[model samples]
Structures are given as structure tokens and as C-alpha cells.
Target: ISMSSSEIIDVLCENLNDGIWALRVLYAEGAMNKEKLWDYINQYHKDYQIENEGKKILPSRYALDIMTARLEGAGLISFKAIGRVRIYDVTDLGNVLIKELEKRVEKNN
Candidate 1:
């Protein structure tokens, strides 16, 4: 099945409530860990902001807690505890979804 960016975004936006789009985007971009996402955001989306109440945009706390919880519930991604930190990884379905999203975005564009 093929899905356009808007369609895929809409599904994710509607379903996974806890930082759905953000988590999916990060996962699709191959960010498996909080640190990796931080690095990517810092390097790529330096101006990304979290808007509160549709008025003020503020720096987000990364929202890993919420993202991880939703991912676990979906069984599309999971985290492993190692030492004092947890590392996230996408499952087969998650990877497939990411690829499909990328392909559709590219195709639609």
C-alpha cells in the first residue's frame, strides 16, 4: 500500500497521541536513541520548536518518555535498557512503515 505524506501524517497524527508525528519522523530518519535524535535535531532542525496552546513556541524536552510509551504500545518499536541509558530500535514493521512513508513522500512530491 502506498500513502502520501499527508495521508501517512494524518494516520499517525490521529492515532498515536503521544508525540506521534515527531516520533515517527525521528524513527524514519533513523534516530534510534534520544542522544541521536538530539544530535540530529541540533544538526538539522536547529529551529524546531514546540508550540504550546497554539501561541508560544518553546524548546521541547525531547519528549522521549511519551514517544517511547506510544512506540511500546504499538509494538512497532522498542527500547533496551543498557547501563544507565535506554536505546530505541525500530521493529520490522516500523522499518517497513518508514520506507513506505519515504517512498510515498518522494513519489508524491
Candidate 2:
């Protein structure tokens, strides 16, 4: 966390918009396994589709792994393989990022 600036920026600017919203899940729900994150992400997308209209945000398993690495490489998270496959969780830096971004979205509507 001591030596990160552009890397963190890249993670936010690059990964956040491309369907890797699992970052929010870990922030909101605490630590989780990789599959759990993927499952919940799928559930969100599936439910939105059932409602008839929504943006398509689901990515393939491969893409998710890429996003996973990007998040970890930037030090925004503690994604590791000590678990069954890998355990995923956010860091303090990630906490601030998520909360501030969450607030910055809007106070209107």
C-alpha cells in the first residue's frame, strides 16, 4: 500500500466499468470465496434480466479471473489461493475507495 498510485487508478478506471462489480460485493458483504462472488454476481444479472430490461454486465469465468488479478495486483484487495480455490476480500484502501465512490454517485433521486 505504500507504493501505489497509477496502479490503483488503473484498477478503478479500467476494471470498475467492465462488469467486475464483485468489488462491491466484498465491500458490502465482507469476505467471500471466488465462486460465491461469481454466483452472486450472476444472480444479480439474472434477476435484472427477469425484470425485462437492464444493462448486460455478466462476463465469462475467464474474464472474472482477469478482473480478480487486476484488483489484487493494484493492492485494492486480498485475493488469494489459500482457500478451496481463492479467497477474496477488500483492503482498507479498497474500503475507502468503495465508500467514497458509493457516496459520490449521487445524493439526488
Candidate 3:
């Protein structure tokens, strides 16, 4: 019952909703209150666009927050709710899932 890299990434991508992306964005911003995730997403998106040179749009921050919540519900990741804010991290399941996803794709010769 082993899954390949593509399978893992596809599954994770499918399972991950907008909220999860927000959580990752917040996590990258260091420990922050839940309210901050929204702000962070905008900044993150802006930076992303700048880095990509107008190749990408600033993803919706609020939508990401909702996706993060969905990921937590799916048990792929874990988040801590401190008062009004939340702290997030990848769970064991998530780690394994990502590890597989990190594998490089190969093209047949």
C-alpha cells in the first residue's frame, strides 16, 4: 500500500484547502496570532509576486485561512489555538506525505 511521489503530492494538494496555505504562511512568519495570518498572506503573496516578477497573483489570504482549518480537520497537520491566534505545524502524517512529494520527477529516456 505504498504511494508514489506524484500520488502523495496530488493527495496532499487535493486535501489541502486554502486555510492550510494560510497556516503555512503564518508559520513562516513565525509565531503569530490568528489575526496575523490574514495580514501575512497578503504580504507573502506580494513578496511572491515580486519574486516571480508578475508571474503569480497574490492568493487570497482569507481563503488560505479557511484551507488551513480544513487541513487541521483532515488530521494531516496540527495547529494550536492560543486565545484568538493559532500556531501551526506539520504533523507526522504531513511530514511523510511531504517527504514523498519532494522526490524529483523522472522522464523516461
Candidate 4:
């Protein structure tokens, strides 16, 4: 009934890599609202490009909103929503996975 560690790291991690960045972003920020995730991502992409690469393009806002739940299903994240509040915090397992990701990410260049 839960995602295996391999599924989480090997599969979903790559599958939702941008989402992994959001986790990193939130974890470092001492808690963040879900609403800010997509905006931050787009802003960073915009910062890297200009004029037209970003044209007719934006990762789906609603898709990003539901993304947290996909991880929530994996137990990597937890949701505490009420009255339109969307807050997801990393669970302990999440931190461990991110650490390994950080470790492997540094093993190469």
C-alpha cells in the first residue's frame, strides 16, 4: 500500500525531478506554502532564459498543485489542508531520500 524506496528514489525521483527541487526548496525555507512552489519554479526558469524560450510555456499550475499529493501518496510528504490552506512538510523518510539524492548528485561532476 506504499511506495517502495526504490520506486520513490529510482522512479518517482527522476519522474518528478522538478518536484524534488521543490522539496529541496521547501525543506530549506523552514516551511513554505504549496502555492509558492510553481511560481518559484517558473521564476527560476525565466531567470535562466529570455524572450521566447519561456513563451507559450508554463508548467501547469493545477498539475503542480496536485503534484504534492502524488508524493503524499508515497508518504514522502504529508498534507494538512483546511479552509484552502495547502501546506506539505517533508516526512523523515523524505529527508533521508533527499540526502541520498544529494550524495549521489555529488558523486559525479
Candidate 5:
């Protein structure tokens, strides 16, 4: 199964209440734990607000769990358990999505 950027984003939007933040955090950090992911999202929330048909973005604490699970299930991320912590990193497909988004942003800018 293959998905384009919009398709993948659409899937994420369906599962994650803060889909954009989750995607950007993962893209920026590459590999990370939950606390670091939330820190980044909290720091950038102001600049990253979106119009979601009046729906409010959920808090990182809640959204990250759903987002990571959905992303991993969709093959967009790889998850591994190290010692006592679980870490998440982008997969090749996730890199493709990030690259595509970057191109679109550059084109618009």
C-alpha cells in the first residue's frame, strides 16, 4: 500500500487531534521520546496554529500517544523499545512525506 502526502496527512488528521504538530515534531526531531516531542510542540504551538473547521487541537500529552500509534501502524514510523523506554523514529516513507511537505512549503514561500 502506498500513500501520497495528502493521503497520509488525511489519515493522520483522522486519528490524531493534533496531527500537524505531531508530524512537525517528528520531522524536526527525527528520533525522540515522548517528553522531548511534547516540549517541541509546546514551544511552537503559537506559530503552528491551524484552522481546523473550529476544532481545537488536543494537548500533546494525549495526542502524541494516538499519533505515534497511528503513524507506526501506517508504516510512517518505526518504534523500538530500548531498556525501559520506547523510542519512535521516522521510516523511509515518513522521510518521503517530510520531503514532499518541504517542497510544497518552499514552492508556496
Candidate 6:
């Protein structure tokens, strides 16, 4: 069976959890490492006042690390090991999810 765009987005959003910003930054940057994702979250807090606390607080580093592993396992992101670090980029599934999410926002507005 095929999923509707909204259904696909719902599943994606559910899985993203505290990783949504991480995904967005990776999506925009094409790829980034753990340190960069952390930095991006810090900067994003300053750039926008997220009304929802869930959107504001980044999970602990260890938690995010595990979450990233989970995201990769779930196929929303692809990981490439580079020397001592792992770089992450959104997969095509992630790109589609983001577009669907944007559509929801546009429809609501």
C-alpha cells in the first residue's frame, strides 16, 4: 500500500524527535558532523524563539549520538565515516519528508 504525503510526514516527524533541527541543518548543509550539528542547534536557539520546548532543547550529546545511530538505522539519514568522525546527510526519504512538512506548514498558514 502507498502512504499519502501527510502520512509519510507524520511518520517522519515522529521519528525525528529532538533530531529535527539536526536534520534540517544537515539538509541545508548537505552534510555535517556531530560537533557541527551541536553548533547549529545552539545557533538556531538564538536565531528563533521556538515556542515549543521540544523544539528548543537539544537532547544530550550521548542521547543525540544514539539518536543519530537510530536515524541512520531507520534510513532517514546516511552516514559516512571520515577519519575520526561520522558525517551525516539527509537521505532522499528525508528530503521528501521535509518537503511534505513544508506543505503542511504552508497549508496551515
Can you list the residue pairs that collide in candidate 1? none
TM-score per candidate, chains pooled = 0.49, 0.65, 0.53, 0.66, 0.59, 0.72
Give the runs in model 5 whose Cα sits over 4 Å from its true position.
Answer: 1-20, 47-60, 106-109
- What is the lDDT of every predicted structure here? 0.54, 0.67, 0.57, 0.64, 0.64, 0.72
TM-score (C-alpha) between model 3 and the true structure: 0.53
lDDT of 4 at 50: 69
> lDDT winner among the candidates?
6
Off by over 4 Å in 6: 1-9, 50-56
Q: Candidate 4 residues 10-108, lDDT tens each? A: 664555554565566567664656677566556655655664365412367776756665667656767677778777677786776688688877996
Question: What tens digits encode model 6's per-residue C-alpha lDDT throughout 63-107?
Answer: 667767767765778878889898778888877767766887899
The lDDT of model 2 is 0.67
What is the C-alpha lDDT profile of model 3 across 12-88, one tens digit per residue? 76665443445456445555555555566666766866766542222565555565667667665577877766766
Q: What is the Cα-based lDDT of residue 92 in candidate 4?
A: 81
Cα error, residue 43 of model 5, in Å, equals 2.3
Q: Which stretches of candidate 4 lie over 4 Å from their true place?
A: 1-15, 44-58
Number of the candidate with higher lDDT, 1 or 6 = 6
lDDT of candidate 3 at residue 63, scale 0 to 100: 59
Question: For candidate 2, what's the RMSD?
Answer: 4.4
For residue 23, give model 6's deviation from the true position in Å. Answer: 1.8
lDDT by residue for model 2 (21-87), tens = 6666787677888888877766666775687755435467786677667767656778677736787
Residue 84 Cα positional deviation in candidate 5, in Å, after optimal superposition: 4.1
lDDT of 3: 0.57
The superposed Cα distance between candidate 1 and the true structure at residue 56, in angstroms, equals: 12
Model 1: residue 88 alpha-carbon error in angstroms: 1.5
